[PDB]
Symmetry: D2
Subunit: 267 residues, 4 copies
């Protein structure tokens, strides 16, 4: 078992298509003991996580809620037992209001919406690290999910800006985490069909955005030297487990691309 | 005159050490006709801008104020005369509350503070472009100021995050600006002793020494050297982007840092 | 004139479509006094350079010829007069044997061929700097031509590797040039129709390489926020002139992109 | 056993301080069956490989020898048995003549020397993939060693240029390897005390260049959020093994940094 004996917190499960659900599944298959966190729809999330290979405690965490963050470490400790600490933390959380996405003009997104998106998608990586580092073991690993924002693209709009901010946040979280002997890294995944952008991807919220996204997906598989399957989150989940393991011990503040190699190819 | 006959808006002047003051000075020396914008202390800003080579109208602009942004294009047009449009726009605006800077712990900056910083330092680049693109001529140029955030570093903390956001915003503003025949670019400057240098050492008496060490280190790393007391090479670079001489460059970052970012030691 | 009173050496003219021909034309329009260097077909190059706005001396330079490089500074000095130095140098020189490009398999290019391409396309940037720095004025500028090699692509093959090497060479030339108060930079241009790859671009050396290149060009103009005209070298020439001027005085070891903004956009 | 049942070729062992020695040791600890290749000093190499946890066959391979490369796959097959194929290949091979490094001026390295260095350090990554891909299993992995050349630095000089070329070569090897269902990646390590470059360091002793090197090397530990120990190759060896495993299945054409996170930090 790649993660035998390791205690890992996984946030971000909302459906069985969630990248976090697959991370959790693979982690448990590899021997990890999990604590899960969920947002807003905890009754539904509980039914979904009951389908994981092993039973895991589910805790509520809205990353915009200061009370939730202040009590998190205490709640986790109660879940894993006094005297035990975490070895891993997975941040698989993102949101950008519709005004900041799709066919909505880039200039028309009010700052209040953009600010909410950046709070949830980027700042929360730092606040979860702040909350959880005091209960992590040395040798531990924090991993977040990125979508390569180094270039602009249609439809992704303000979420691209939030991911640029997240990459920067990760480099600073690494500085803090290193004081605890903990690594911090992002996995930059290729596009996966999940609930988050399903309405935009399907064309429901503007045919143009749907068409642009189809072009992006087709080009991604084309450019990836080993191809890319947008319906299979397993390669991404495996990569996250690699970073949670002891086998990338000198990598921190960094981004590991689980994208079929697409970002390394122009055409 | 590199910018002869060009009408250019320059934001960001607060003292005669401001990068924006030197941009304005060099632009005027090169024949540009300017409109200036200032934040908050407009009477004091007027006294500062009187030190420029030529007179220029000064307009109030708080980039967090939606009323200011909605009226800006109209106020500019009254300043430059009906029928006339801008050829250039300079965004030289930044702020991050002290909780997000210096020796204050990275984790202790509340989101309200970080969000204000991002609003002023990154989102406002898009806000300005939205307000002014409708009164810009084809061939025009929008330029903002950047400090290379590709790697983390001490003290710069959350402003680094805001600059990472700004670089992303710039790539999207370029998509919009291109529809108008306008380019959008950032100049990533080396460190300059402006009023804002005090923001990164907000420490004790060690501040002066730390700044002196920064200058020593940057000048060593830069293959052509670096003088933190001299904003002129940065100002010239901004003027190059405002000119007709980089006509195929957009969404991009020009480094005016003495070449330091290309060297490891 | 942007370059009034400046003495500038321009290498790399072979036809009137050469990027160097347009650099030369624009520089002369901006008041520069030129010295030109040409390779192999000097009688033909002389006829071509006679069509420039002003007369300029033409010197022979094969960058693989040690005797040519050893005598170059003295020949330039004779051309511009004793007591006078250069303010600028433009390297617009490239070559990669056909085995290293197009439909020819990447693995099948013999090292002898790849080595020749790297010699001419990358090492010679250092060779020319070595020869000419001793006769350059402080405030001077060396500029070479790059095609962004940060990602792999079809057909460009080993020339991509040579450009990666050239970018690295440029960073080291900057260190040396700095001692003389001279800047060194590359301009990464978008694709321009010139003699160099004309046979491959036309499909004459393999239809698939022609097809791949057409796709690359179509995509380039599409992504470029201000568009891209592959038949117009003028924007690239202007950019080189900007770097030769006094207006980018703090930029060195660097790469300026004159590509319509295409490299900043994914799609 | 991370590499249980995998058959892996490891090149580049010359001393028990070689990065390749540590890669081989860790791979064997994780259940891999190895074939080793050595250059020039085969009697010494055999004595050294006797220090590994398990016996592995040693084959001669000079990457500049076309006959060695032509016969390599047949020799490997005889070593692992007909019907069996490789799951992994490690390229841990590098060389740049002294003229191209250290206190020797950058401009004084003759191209003959630079070309040799680029042949061994960059082109041979493609040569080895060409020779071995036909006997690799799908799901397989090729890994090479890189030293981040994105910025210039004192002393490393023309080796930096060779590594820039290598990174470009890796992106093209990934295109070819993908046709076989094989991944290709580099690990960019922080500085390790392997005895490589001892002659370069020795020439720089007490000089400015020597001081520069010590400042540069020690810069990794300063900048690395988790620190960096130049005396310990194990974290690098582990990272290579992670890439050889099934746990980074969507990463190709890419660079993994095993440098303590130093490259993500400016100071
Ligand atoms: N799907 C892709 O193609 C892709 C590619 C690269 C990166 N990512 C990133 O991967 C992560 C997971 O995305 P996904 O595709 O699995 O979509 P998803 O919808 O299945 O998961 C996103 C999660 O964010 C959670 N969330 C939203 N607001 C929250 C809040 N205030 N507090 C706590 N949690 C909150 C949601 O409840 C949900 O569980 C995100 O960071 C996303 O940006 C997705
Ligand atoms: N000084 C450096 O070393 C350096 C290096 C690279 C980039 N920069 C950037 O250059 C730009 C100018 O900085 P500077 O060094 O000249 O400092 P400065 O203090 O002289 O200028 C900063 C400007 O931001 C303006 N500003 C703050 N809040 C505003 C608001 N709500 N609305 C409108 N304007 C507002 C200030 O009033 C001021 O005029 C900034 O973007 C800064 O981040 C500075
Ligand atoms: N055309 C494009 O799209 C494009 C895009 C980006 C960069 N570039 C680069 O721009 C430069 C000029 O290319 P071009 O497109 O004008 O093609 P070109 O054929 O018009 O010019 C290439 C020059 O290299 C010269 N050359 C070849 N071997 C030489 C040697 N041994 N010694 C001296 N000179 C030698 C040729 O004689 C010729 O004058 C090259 O470095 C090329 O790689 C071209
Ligand atoms: N030591 C470091 O700090 C460091 C850091 C990053 C990357 N690297 C890279 O790691 C790899 C291994 O280097 P090392 O430090 O273990 O030094 P090393 O001397 O122990 O290994 C280098 C290997 O290259 C082999 N080699 C040289 N010419 C050859 C040829 N013609 N044919 C076949 N093999 C040949 C040598 O025989 C030797 O075994 C190299 O690519 C090096 O550049 C080293
Ligand atoms: C134009 C880009 C197409 C590929 C996008 C890949 C991609 C990147 C994503 O970051 C993503 O996740 C979100 C996006 C938005 C919101 N509100 C919430 C989430 C969790 C989904 N997907 C699918
Ligand atoms: C570790 C070295 C960092 C050097 C930073 C250079 C630098 C970069 C800057 O972005 C900057 O400007 C500000 C920063 C903060 C605020 N509130 C307002 C401003 C205008 C000043 N300086 C001087
Ligand atoms: C697949 C990429 C297509 C666009 C390539 C752009 C481009 C890049 C080039 O480097 C180029 O110049 C050469 C290329 C090869 C040789 N032997 C000599 C030269 C001078 C021409 N072109 C046109
Ligand atoms: C000046 C940079 C200091 C840190 C360099 C790290 C480093 C990088 C290396 O690429 C390296 O390996 C060689 C270098 C040259 C040759 N001929 C052969 C080899 C195997 C050793 N080291 C130690």
């Amino acid at each position: 078992g790649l993660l035998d004996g390791k205690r890992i917190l996984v946030s971000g499960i909302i459906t069985d298509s969630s990248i976090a659900f697959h991370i959790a599944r693979v982690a448990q298959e590899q021997g990890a003991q999990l604590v899960l966190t969920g947002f807003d729809r905890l009754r539904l999330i509980q039914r979904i996580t009951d389908r994981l290979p092993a039973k895991a405690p589910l805790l509520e965490l809205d990353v915009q809620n200061e009370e939730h963050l202040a009590s998190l470490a205490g709640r986790v400790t109660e879940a894993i037992g006094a005297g035990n600490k975490l070895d891993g933390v997975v941040h698989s959380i993102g949101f950008m209001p519709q005004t900041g996405m799709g066919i909505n003009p880039f200039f028309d997104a009010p700052y209040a919406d953009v600010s909410k998106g950046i709070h949830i998608s980027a700042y929360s990586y730092a606040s979860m690290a702040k909350a959880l580092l005091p209960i992590m073991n040395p040798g531990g690993s924090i991993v977040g999910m990125d979508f390569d924002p180094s270039r602009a693209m249609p439809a992704y709009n303000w979420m691209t800006v939030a991911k640029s901010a997240l990459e920067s946040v990760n480099r600073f979280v690494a500085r803090e985490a290193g004081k605890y002997g903990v690594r911090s890294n992002l996995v930059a995944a290729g596009p996966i069909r999940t609930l988050a952008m399903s309405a935009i991807v399907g064309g429901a919220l503007g045919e143009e955005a749907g068409a642009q996204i189809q072009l992006l997906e087709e080009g991604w598989d084309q450019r990836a030297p080993i191809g890319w399957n947008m319906k299979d989150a397993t390669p991404v989940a495996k990569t996250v487990c690699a970073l949670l393991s002891d086998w990338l011990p000198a990598t921190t503040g960094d981004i590991i691309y689980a994208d079929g190699g697409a970002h390394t190819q122009l055409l």
